[PDB]
Design a protein around this ligand. Sequence first.
Ligand SMILES: [Cu+2]
Length: 99
Amino acid sequence: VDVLLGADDGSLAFVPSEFSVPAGEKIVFKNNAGFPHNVLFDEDAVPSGVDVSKISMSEEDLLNAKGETFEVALSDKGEYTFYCSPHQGAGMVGKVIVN
Ligand SMILES: [Cu+2]
């Protein structure tokens, strides 16, 4: 599943912001507009057993160009919150449900 970083109108959103996926399906975060963006998972809002460092960019690493991707595959079922580090305080957060 593809998830855009930034809407075509400049909004600071993941697109889609919430979606469900089967366990192990690859999620392709694709840089879109309104840079910079990145993707990290919230250690406080993932299923128990999940290590967010394995599925997160380094906070220092930013995507500044259209078409750069960050790809992950989540194997543990449950709810995960992801966020954009620069844009977390502007509400660029999302939730994926792995089922
Ligand atoms: Cu962002």
